Design an enzyme around this catalytic site. Structure first.
Site, PDB file in Angstrom:
ATOM      1  N   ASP A   1      -0.569  -3.405  14.836  1.00  0.00           N
ATOM      2  CA  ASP A   1      -1.130  -3.649  13.589  1.00  0.00           C
ATOM      3  C   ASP A   1      -2.572  -4.344  13.052  1.00  0.00           C
ATOM      4  O   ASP A   1      -3.847  -3.621  13.326  1.00  0.00           O
ATOM      5  CB  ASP A   1       0.093  -3.515  12.514  1.00  0.00           C
ATOM      6  CG  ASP A   1      -1.093  -3.743  11.406  1.00  0.00           C
ATOM      7  OD1 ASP A   1      -2.184  -4.231  10.574  1.00  0.00           O
ATOM      8  OD2 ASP A   1       0.432  -3.357  10.310  1.00  0.00           O
ATOM      9  N   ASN A   2      -2.409  -5.316  13.303  1.00  0.00           N
ATOM     10  CA  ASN A   2      -3.995  -6.014  12.373  1.00  0.00           C
ATOM     11  C   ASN A   2      -4.614  -5.718  13.616  1.00  0.00           C
ATOM     12  O   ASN A   2      -6.037  -5.705  13.539  1.00  0.00           O
ATOM     13  CB  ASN A   2      -3.894  -7.694  13.227  1.00  0.00           C
ATOM     14  CG  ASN A   2      -2.136  -7.647  11.809  1.00  0.00           C
ATOM     15  OD1 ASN A   2      -1.494  -6.940  11.535  1.00  0.00           O
ATOM     16  ND2 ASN A   2      -2.372  -9.119  11.309  1.00  0.00           N
TER      17      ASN A   2
ATOM     18  N   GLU B   1       4.312  -9.056   4.781  1.00  0.00           N
ATOM     19  CA  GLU B   1       3.538  -8.245   5.446  1.00  0.00           C
ATOM     20  C   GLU B   1       2.605  -8.968   6.440  1.00  0.00           C
ATOM     21  O   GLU B   1       2.876  -8.497   8.370  1.00  0.00           O
ATOM     22  CB  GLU B   1       3.359  -6.911   5.227  1.00  0.00           C
ATOM     23  CG  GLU B   1       2.697  -6.127   6.422  1.00  0.00           C
ATOM     24  CD  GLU B   1       3.222  -5.241   7.296  1.00  0.00           C
ATOM     25  OE1 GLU B   1       4.841  -5.221   7.016  1.00  0.00           O
ATOM     26  OE2 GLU B   1       2.993  -4.163   7.745  1.00  0.00           O
TER      27      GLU B   1
ATOM     28  N   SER C   1       4.640  -2.060  12.574  1.00  0.00           N
ATOM     29  CA  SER C   1       5.097  -3.005  11.751  1.00  0.00           C
ATOM     30  C   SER C   1       6.073  -2.997  11.054  1.00  0.00           C
ATOM     31  O   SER C   1       7.541  -3.573  10.466  1.00  0.00           O
ATOM     32  CB  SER C   1       3.827  -2.611  10.823  1.00  0.00           C
ATOM     33  OG  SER C   1       2.136  -2.656  11.466  1.00  0.00           O
TER      34      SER C   1
ATOM     35  N   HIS D   1       1.061  -1.372  -0.085  1.00  0.00           N
ATOM     36  CA  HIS D   1      -0.227   0.368  -0.251  1.00  0.00           C
ATOM     37  C   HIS D   1       0.657   1.122   0.091  1.00  0.00           C
ATOM     38  O   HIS D   1       1.049   2.029   1.183  1.00  0.00           O
ATOM     39  CB  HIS D   1      -0.889   0.039   0.794  1.00  0.00           C
ATOM     40  CG  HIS D   1      -1.678  -1.254   1.462  1.00  0.00           C
ATOM     41  ND1 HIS D   1      -2.574  -1.589   0.235  1.00  0.00           N
ATOM     42  CD2 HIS D   1      -1.190  -2.395   2.278  1.00  0.00           C
ATOM     43  CE1 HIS D   1      -3.277  -3.015   0.506  1.00  0.00           C
ATOM     44  NE2 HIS D   1      -2.736  -2.986   1.830  1.00  0.00           N
TER      45      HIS D   1
ATOM     46  N   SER E   1      -5.604   1.402  -2.506  1.00  0.00           N
ATOM     47  CA  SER E   1      -4.574   1.867  -1.143  1.00  0.00           C
ATOM     48  C   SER E   1      -3.993   2.908  -1.021  1.00  0.00           C
ATOM     49  O   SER E   1      -2.991   3.323  -0.314  1.00  0.00           O
ATOM     50  CB  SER E   1      -4.103   0.273  -0.610  1.00  0.00           C
ATOM     51  OG  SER E   1      -3.631  -0.413  -1.333  1.00  0.00           O
TER      52      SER E   1
ATOM     53  N   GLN F   1       9.647  -4.688   9.551  1.00  0.00           N
ATOM     54  CA  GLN F   1      10.279  -4.909   7.818  1.00  0.00           C
ATOM     55  C   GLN F   1      10.999  -4.580   8.172  1.00  0.00           C
ATOM     56  O   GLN F   1      12.241  -5.407   6.910  1.00  0.00           O
ATOM     57  CB  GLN F   1       8.911  -4.129   7.144  1.00  0.00           C
ATOM     58  CG  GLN F   1       8.137  -4.478   6.436  1.00  0.00           C
ATOM     59  CD  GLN F   1       7.901  -5.449   6.308  1.00  0.00           C
ATOM     60  OE1 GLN F   1       9.266  -6.446   6.172  1.00  0.00           O
ATOM     61  NE2 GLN F   1       6.697  -6.966   5.916  1.00  0.00           N
TER      62      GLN F   1
ATOM     63  N   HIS G   1      -3.834   2.439   8.245  1.00  0.00           N
ATOM     64  CA  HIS G   1      -4.197   2.346  10.249  1.00  0.00           C
ATOM     65  C   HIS G   1      -2.673   3.775  10.085  1.00  0.00           C
ATOM     66  O   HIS G   1      -1.630   4.129   9.407  1.00  0.00           O
ATOM     67  CB  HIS G   1      -2.580   1.388  10.088  1.00  0.00           C
ATOM     68  CG  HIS G   1      -3.233   0.430  10.394  1.00  0.00           C
ATOM     69  ND1 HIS G   1      -4.777   0.184  10.256  1.00  0.00           N
ATOM     70  CD2 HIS G   1      -3.456  -1.337  10.566  1.00  0.00           C
ATOM     71  CE1 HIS G   1      -5.053  -1.046  10.170  1.00  0.00           C
ATOM     72  NE2 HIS G   1      -4.084  -2.040  10.422  1.00  0.00           N
TER      73      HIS G   1
ATOM     74  N   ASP H   1       3.593  -7.881   0.932  1.00  0.00           N
ATOM     75  CA  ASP H   1       1.941  -7.521   1.922  1.00  0.00           C
ATOM     76  C   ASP H   1       0.627  -8.139   0.691  1.00  0.00           C
ATOM     77  O   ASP H   1       0.370  -7.796   0.230  1.00  0.00           O
ATOM     78  CB  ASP H   1       1.915  -5.599   2.239  1.00  0.00           C
ATOM     79  CG  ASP H   1       0.473  -5.974   2.762  1.00  0.00           C
ATOM     80  OD1 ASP H   1      -0.168  -6.749   3.077  1.00  0.00           O
ATOM     81  OD2 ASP H   1       0.704  -4.786   3.855  1.00  0.00           O
TER      82      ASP H   1
ATOM     83  N   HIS I   1      -7.577  -8.858   3.456  1.00  0.00           N
ATOM     84  CA  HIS I   1      -7.078  -8.787   2.579  1.00  0.00           C
ATOM     85  C   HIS I   1      -7.425  -8.191   0.726  1.00  0.00           C
ATOM     86  O   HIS I   1      -7.387  -7.225  -0.016  1.00  0.00           O
ATOM     87  CB  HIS I   1      -5.434  -9.984   2.473  1.00  0.00           C
ATOM     88  CG  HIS I   1      -4.548  -9.233   1.795  1.00  0.00           C
ATOM     89  ND1 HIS I   1      -4.040  -7.912   2.179  1.00  0.00           N
ATOM     90  CD2 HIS I   1      -4.153  -9.389  -0.109  1.00  0.00           C
ATOM     91  CE1 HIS I   1      -3.198  -7.700   0.581  1.00  0.00           C
ATOM     92  NE2 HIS I   1      -3.413  -8.475   0.195  1.00  0.00           N
TER      93      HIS I   1
ATOM     94  N   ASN J   1       4.441 -10.542  10.110  1.00  0.00           N
ATOM     95  CA  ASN J   1       2.809 -10.024  10.470  1.00  0.00           C
ATOM     96  C   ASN J   1       3.313 -10.813  12.351  1.00  0.00           C
ATOM     97  O   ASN J   1       2.327 -10.362  12.745  1.00  0.00           O
ATOM     98  CB  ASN J   1       1.992 -10.874  10.223  1.00  0.00           C
ATOM     99  CG  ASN J   1       0.555 -10.726  10.569  1.00  0.00           C
ATOM    100  OD1 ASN J   1       0.079  -9.820   9.772  1.00  0.00           O
ATOM    101  ND2 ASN J   1      -0.097 -11.904  11.444  1.00  0.00           N
TER     102      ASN J   1
ATOM    103  N   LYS K   1       3.815  -6.385  15.693  1.00  0.00           N
ATOM    104  CA  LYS K   1       2.716  -5.996  14.579  1.00  0.00           C
ATOM    105  C   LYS K   1       1.611  -6.280  14.400  1.00  0.00           C
ATOM    106  O   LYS K   1       0.450  -5.744  15.090  1.00  0.00           O
ATOM    107  CB  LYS K   1       3.644  -6.798  13.066  1.00  0.00           C
ATOM    108  CG  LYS K   1       3.120  -6.688  11.712  1.00  0.00           C
ATOM    109  CD  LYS K   1       1.736  -6.963  11.813  1.00  0.00           C
ATOM    110  CE  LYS K   1       1.220  -6.379  10.069  1.00  0.00           C
ATOM    111  NZ  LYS K   1      -0.270  -7.636   9.563  1.00  0.00           N
TER     112      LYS K   1
ATOM    113  N   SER L   1       2.328  -0.763  -4.933  1.00  0.00           N
ATOM    114  CA  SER L   1       0.766  -0.680  -4.371  1.00  0.00           C
ATOM    115  C   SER L   1       0.455  -2.860  -4.104  1.00  0.00           C
ATOM    116  O   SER L   1       0.031  -2.880  -5.240  1.00  0.00           O
ATOM    117  CB  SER L   1      -0.558   0.027  -4.037  1.00  0.00           C
ATOM    118  OG  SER L   1      -0.921   0.324  -3.459  1.00  0.00           O
TER     119      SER L   1
ATOM    120  N   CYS M   1      -7.208  -1.497  12.378  1.00  0.00           N
ATOM    121  CA  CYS M   1      -8.721  -1.858  12.547  1.00  0.00           C
ATOM    122  C   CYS M   1      -9.446  -1.237  13.156  1.00  0.00           C
ATOM    123  O   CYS M   1     -10.380  -0.781  12.975  1.00  0.00           O
ATOM    124  CB  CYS M   1      -8.494  -3.070  12.274  1.00  0.00           C
ATOM    125  SG  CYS M   1      -7.573  -3.720  10.645  1.00  0.00           S
TER     126      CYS M   1
END
Ligand SMILES: NC(=O)c1ccc[n+]([C@@H]2O[C@H](COP(=O)([O-])OP(=O)(O)OC[C@H]3O[C@@H](n4cnc5c(N)ncnc54)[C@H](O)[C@@H]3O)[C@@H](O)[C@H]2O)c1
Ligand SMILES: NC(=O)c1ccc[n+]([C@@H]2O[C@H](COP(=O)([O-])OP(=O)(O)OC[C@H]3O[C@@H](n4cnc5c(N)ncnc54)[C@H](O)[C@@H]3O)[C@@H](O)[C@H]2O)c1
Ligand SMILES: NC(=O)c1ccc[n+]([C@@H]2O[C@H](COP(=O)([O-])OP(=O)(O)OC[C@H]3O[C@@H](n4cnc5c(N)ncnc54)[C@H](O)[C@@H]3O)[C@@H](O)[C@H]2O)c1
Ligand SMILES: NC(=O)c1ccc[n+]([C@@H]2O[C@H](COP(=O)([O-])OP(=O)(O)OC[C@H]3O[C@@H](n4cnc5c(N)ncnc54)[C@H](O)[C@@H]3O)[C@@H](O)[C@H]2O)c1
Ligand SMILES: Nc1ncnc2[nH]cnc12
Ligand SMILES: Nc1ncnc2[nH]cnc12
Ligand SMILES: Nc1ncnc2[nH]cnc12
Ligand SMILES: [Rb+]
Lengths: 461, 460, 460, 460
Positions: D189-190, D155, D381, D52, D80, D385, D373, D130, D314, D180, D185, D75, D194
């Site tokens: 993130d997840n 990711e 995240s 993204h 995105s 990486q 996010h 990702d 996803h 992930n 992460k 991307s 969200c």
């Protein structure tokens, strides 16, 4: 030599006194009044008949009134709400109290009568402090000569206020009253946040049930219903709310609750066919909050999910049709104030029956019946208002006024906003909160004095 | 048709799409269209309207028109218009003068275009206002027009305060309805609307994570309650300031720490009185008061580097933005988002760390950086507006005999019965089911089965 | 002869009434009773059990017995027994040695009465423990008994740590199952059980309002997460301390401020390193760590007057209560509630303002001042215990030759498939309905339709 | 410089302004840029990136470049990209091929432009992905390029599943790090990402009030947990569907009702299996699964009129949008917002009431209708990486002989010590203060003072 009392066990007094000392540290508004007014003795000569739950919190109220010069005679306003150690501590302090946890109805009435009478004749009462109106009603029905010499009534709770307003409308109220309930620091503190604290508390003490993930139905969404719904939702219950008042219902929707009725399309036709049996068959817990009658009725009780808990946190037990249950179903005491009600019949039960309900406190107000009611720091607000109200009516001396002046003063009033704010400030300071002082320009801009009051009388908070 | 000024008329089709969605979110207003269509109770009404030109306002306008009114419209804020809404209304042949991003001079011009038609004062006979600016202009600059006006319906807390001050001073010339103090307005819009829209606006302007960060909300009235919840529900650590101890008590019980920007709460205007330790920890300050200079220059100097500053009260003077314009350098990030560099007035380093982020130049942030309250909340407010317009228009104050006008010159609220009827429509929109009292229950609590359910003293 | 010791056998009928209610709240455990009744998988098992003698434990005990086991039971804490539960179990003919309010000497005696039957070692062959004390005693004092024991099933985080240390040192004599680390244990009991029971215990001991007051939770593992929620959901302003930055990150994102009792997080052992300003604002401190001396003497000296101090980790040494017994005067309010007067050791003034309130003498507060976790939560833990007992009993480690016993010493968890099966029964108890994967969906995500649904790496 | 394709290069200065703000919100990632700038650990790395193209990704890209890498970027979703971000990166002289609103052909073309430079394979030696689309193209179409690639850093949950499938089949050609499953992460993130961005996107697309309305969240993994909270914190009444009973148990204990779209959870493909009463009450459905066809045609037929439908997993195939394109008429409200009219395929009535609102054409809604996010979450995240890139690049897999490659061909996670170091920087960003263990406390729990603090089995 002091013997003018009746309590469960005087030996509980030292325990009660330890708890009173802790409670004083949790009640800054009330203790602030005791410190401010002890010198002046504004209640010197006051003779107060009190009828309110004989808890540790009430004990701090009583001893504040006494410290300001009053003499009192006390009873509880519910058969299950007394804390025996509080009653004992008050009796040990030389104060007449007639109260124990687990009164019969006959004992309840007798206790109120023992406040009214001293040595078999009317006491020289001149003030009344009531919660729910039962003492007020007895005085009006049975002791009108005593009301001639009483300066006023200070009424604690929503149901009691309704009763007073009915007397006023009918022309039968004999002395003026202060509606203590409708101070903001009472209604929007005690009624709401007190039930938020104490509803889940009582259900846990009675049943030890997990609440998270389970389904509740709260009947009503006034101050008590708002607090009650939050008590349950903060524990992770899935709470549905019933209401007759669409404005309160709107609030419940916006607060994140689904609004439902126990009856199909909200219409009770008197028959079982009008019950939403699918809804009620999924409910694990029902709580009544209304101040109304028969809002958890026989047909609802028949339709509830097996093993549901039923309780009431409104003032009187007639919110729930417990009389139906006593007439038709078998009661098995689990422990004091916790009964399984077996829907299989009246005369006996199988110890392993699955088809029962659990009723708390025999339908009496559950927070006080199965726990200890609201916490001290909440009751601080209510009871600071009570003390202020007693001072105001006692100073006004209604009983001594000429007839033409009595006619002008015979009313049901609330305390002035400025006093409500003064109570609130002490509460905030108790939390360590710091209120900002308006600048002169800001005070002018919003049209208030720097010291308050800060809102118009129309304001709803 | 040319009697309008909007940013871009080609946005009209989009606006109409969003109006059609909004109608489905506004059951109380749509219910009024159905109920009153036949009567046409606003036939002959000529309404000057001044309120945020959003999609929700568009549904209000078209309800008034459906009930017989003609209108001429402007926004009550320079940043609150949604240009697609304004375009849809102009495309429907309705005079509207509004765009997002007006100057102050253009703002005044737009209000004047509602007051004048074809170069001279319109024959207006009703006013709908949000905040009092139109009301003030009519009283100060067009008093003759008020001779023919039957009433004002005022939306918001600040506007009502202004009306009550005029009444106390004897300068209010026509009666008014305080729409703000319906329960289905004040305890819906002001509170839950800000709950929805404050976090929305902050996210759209900054995309900042809110969880775990420190906020200070100045005020804990209706707006402050909703704003505090908007932030706390996202996981902010929220502190609340108040002058009113009752509101402060509520904040404590609701789980907030109550603090003052000033040591011991005493604001003597000096730098020394600022609680610098407190303000140096704050990531976000939000003003909610309706008062003046509640986020002052010394507070702005003391805030944590990179803090966000915004206002959700009606007027921008809650924050001393004038101090910031005079002393510090403004870097536009994107529209309605400025970095304010505390290093000096004339220029800035692109990589300076010592800046604040100001949203909407201090103007009401929900409308400035997002879209204000959602349709289903505005339904309540605007149902009350339509009912209030009907009531004052039907009363025909301007045409009453002098003795009767004296009795009717007041600032009143709508009857509780009507507040409840609006609420019922809102509840039904959620699929909620209200229980009906039995006759015995209604007798027991002393109310009619149909309501009203509460005495006028009740606070909800 | 009565082969039990309980406070009051007349409480048995009350206990039995509450067991019958509890069975209705424990569907996973009752499901195991029904599923395994025919097989009698624990026929011939002789289980030494040491775990809080609550109503919930009673349902566990009676499940073990219903599946064929004999047991001998004690509590794992001096304050955690519910006397009515102990009485109901004794009345059912099961040896139990437990009462609320044991001395330390009585506690040890009670464990010894399980180990010995009629003056000699019982022919035990299984151990169920919570915290490791029974495990420790067997290894220290009765090593020959371990030659006949097939395994230990350990309930709690601290007990598992102790087992792993023995395994690393070569001192563990029999294999074990770590019941704690089933998801339906750790991420149920440790977290949600403390969410339910922490505020419960504080209310029962003090009846303090929690809303609006300041708390400090030391730790943010499973217990700390649940404890923090218990307080925040009541409206406390909660701050969290942690040594583990990942747990601290979770606390931040969950909406808590992360702070240390020590300046810059560094304890130098002296009062100078204490953040006295922080601790002087705290109304409530709760330890959740399973570590030692995390609420130390210098912290205790610095706490706000009249603060409440409690521990919900397994052992009381989280708090320096020894310092308090040596230096300060203890006033019993009621059982398990003491005011600790910081004025000196020898006497106190009944009206002193400078005291702390300690709950349960620092022992686990949920069980000491309330009733611990609720039945519907304990269902998950105890279903896992039953499954673990079945597994180790069937494996028959004690009958292996010596060379193979050496090779078979491990600390294992239950398979994920069983964790899921327990979870399903819990969900059904709420009325929840789990969806079944289609064959195409199961193929798409790479699992069997029946599960397991997640790789062993998954953290939930 | 011309080796790029973006929507509008003139957006670059805006993008740069937002990058400068984002750097201040990303302390872990910026900490790595500062720590490793001298050493240049990615000197010689040539990274194919597919993720993204947001402002957050821009900070990641510029960190990799600052540490010595060259990159070529695209991307991983058609909706995105933030065009201002892409422009700022292109203006910095970095090859990027990305814009918001790509067609599927343009999407593939953009990935191919990363792979090829001047019409021939670039000398890539690392991959950052990702979702696995780039990874799949390299394995299927460019196996010779994989010979010289040292590793893949993946990711997201779906991409990891795809890698693990390749590994199981023996078709994975280079080792990977599962980024992930760092705690900083997956459980940052997840979940919290969200929580922030789901309600954000729904508000930007629809401006619907959420409070008081009914939602159904399909799934309760990390994304479903965060999504459910995003909606419940706004006052929605949220129901949750799951196939995994452990996750379902968590949903129950978290205060949600667990329901299935299907009677008894059996998804047999029939219309009659749909719980019509349930779906007819739902105002919002959100898919979170990473699975296929979890909001199916029969569910879409049964949904309440005017429900919103969106996906935050996803890939768009969570929802049967193909059925909707084949059968129903689509009316664009505005970009990434469609009304889908259930009245038929060929035209619609502008005032039809029987429609659904689909966001982002079923593509991940947070990124499609909002900005994904926030920076302070993506910091975690993206710090992982960078660490993962360093690790695989330093290991130099491509240069190992065949026998040595066999030992290193795996899908691994980063070490816990690194996860903790990322978390510490995140906590410091909030102003959090972690406590330092004393040596005796570290000994008591069996860890080094510096960590790691938990065993590898720990689930947080
Ligand atoms: N247990 C306690 O400690 C405690 C605390 C304060 C007050 N009270 C008592 O609780 C009761 C409620 O007090 P309140 O202040 O919330 O009153 P309230 O008037 O604010 O609220 C009562 C609500 O019940 C609703 N209602 C009435 N009949 C109903 C029905 N049939 N179905 C559904 N909703 C119905 C009303 O519309 C109203 O909103 C009173 O009896 C009061 O004295 C108890
Ligand atoms: N943005 C919106 O969409 C929106 C919505 C409704 C109302 N409003 C506006 O928001 C403002 C607030 O409205 P409200 O209905 O909440 O009013 P309110 O009177 O209920 O609340 C304002 C609060 O500010 C407090 N306050 C005043 N001066 C203060 C100071 N110096 N420091 C701290 N607290 C102070 C007051 O004590 C009061 O409780 C008004 O301007 C109103 O018109 C905006
Ligand atoms: N009371 C109960 O019913 C109950 C329930 C389950 C577990 N337990 C007990 O609670 C304890 C904690 O269990 P858990 O499962 O949460 O363990 P855990 O390992 O998940 O969590 C403990 C946390 O304490 C933190 N910690 C350690 N030393 C610290 C310090 N000095 N300052 C701050 N944080 C520190 C660790 O980093 C860790 O995250 C154990 O003793 C366990 O046996 C009690
Ligand atoms: N939009 C974003 O920014 C974002 C962020 C992170 C991850 N993701 C993506 O979101 C998806 C989910 O990721 P995650 O980390 O939560 O995965 P996860 O494995 O933790 O959770 C997915 C859940 O879906 C459940 N599930 C599967 N099929 C189901 C069905 N038919 N009905 C109900 N539940 C079902 C599973 O049991 C599981 O618990 C993946 O595609 C991932 O790549 C998106
Ligand atoms: N959406 C909106 N439209 C009109 N007035 C408003 N006030 C707040 N939000 C509004
Ligand atoms: N109720 C309970 N019974 C047994 N062990 C427990 N651990 C926590 N709560 C418990
Ligand atoms: N803002 C963002 N940037 C890049 N990848 C993301 N995934 C989720 N949100 C993201
Ligand atoms: Rb809006």
């Amino acid at each position: 030599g002091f013997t003018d009392y009746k309590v469960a066990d005087i030996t509980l007094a030292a325990w009660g006194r330890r708890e009173l000392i802790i409670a004083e540290s949790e009640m800054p508004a009330l203790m602030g009044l005791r410190r401010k007014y002890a010198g002046q003795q504004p209640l010197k000569g006051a003779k107060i008949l009190g009828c309110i739950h004989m808890t540790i919190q009430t004990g701090v109220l009583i001893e504040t009134l006494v410290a300001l010069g009053a003499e009192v005679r006390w009873s509880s306003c519910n058969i299950f709400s007394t804390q025996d150690q509080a009653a004992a501590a008050i009796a040990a302090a030389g104060i007449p109290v007639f109260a124990w946890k687990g009164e019969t109805e006959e004992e309840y009435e007798w206790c109120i009568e023992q406040t009214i009478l001293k040595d078999g004749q009317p006491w020289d009462a001149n003030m009344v402090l009531d919660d729910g109106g039962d003492l007020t009603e007895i005085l009006h029905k049975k002791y009108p000569q005593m009301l001639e010499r009483i300066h006023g009534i200070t009424e604690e709770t929503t149901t009691g206020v309704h009763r007073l307003l009915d007397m006023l409308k009918n022309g039968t109220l004999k002395v003026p009253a202060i509606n203590v309930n409708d101070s903001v620091t009472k209604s929007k503190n005690d009624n709401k946040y007190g039930c938020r604290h104490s509803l889940n508390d009582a259900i846990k003490r009675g049943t030890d049930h997990l609440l998270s993930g389970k389904q509740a139905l709260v009947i009503g969404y006034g101050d008590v219903g708002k607090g009650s719904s939050q008590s349950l939702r903060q524990e992770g219950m899935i709470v549905k709310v019933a209401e007759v008042d669409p404005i309160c219902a709107m609030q419940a929707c916006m607060d994140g609750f689904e609004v439902v009725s126990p009856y199909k399309n909200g219409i009770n036709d008197g028959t079982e066919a009008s019950i939403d049996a699918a809804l009620l068959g999924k409910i694990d817990l029902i709580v009544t909050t209304t101040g109304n009658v028969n809002v958890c009725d026989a047909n609802m009780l028949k339709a509830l999910k097996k093993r549901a808990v039923v309780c009431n946190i409104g003032h009187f037990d007639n919110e729930i049709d417990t009389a139906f249950m006593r007439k038709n179903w078998a009661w098995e005491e689990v422990k004091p104030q916790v009964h399984k009600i077996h829907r299989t019949g009246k005369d006996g039960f199988d110890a392993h029956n699955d088809d029962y309900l659990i009723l708390l406190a025999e339908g009496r107000l559950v927070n006080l019946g199965n726990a200890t009611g609201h916490p001290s720091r909440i009751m601080d607000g209510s009871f600071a208002n009570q003390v202020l109200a007693q001072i105001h009516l006692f100073e006004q001396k209604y009983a001594d006024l000429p007839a033409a002046e009595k006619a002008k003063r015979l009313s049901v009033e609330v305390l002035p906003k400025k006093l409500d704010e003064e109570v609130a400030l002490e509460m905030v300071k108790g939390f360590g909160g710091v209120v900002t002082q308006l600048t002169p320009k800001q005070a002018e801009y919003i049209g208030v004095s720097v010291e308050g009051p800060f809102k118009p009388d129309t304001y709803r908070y």
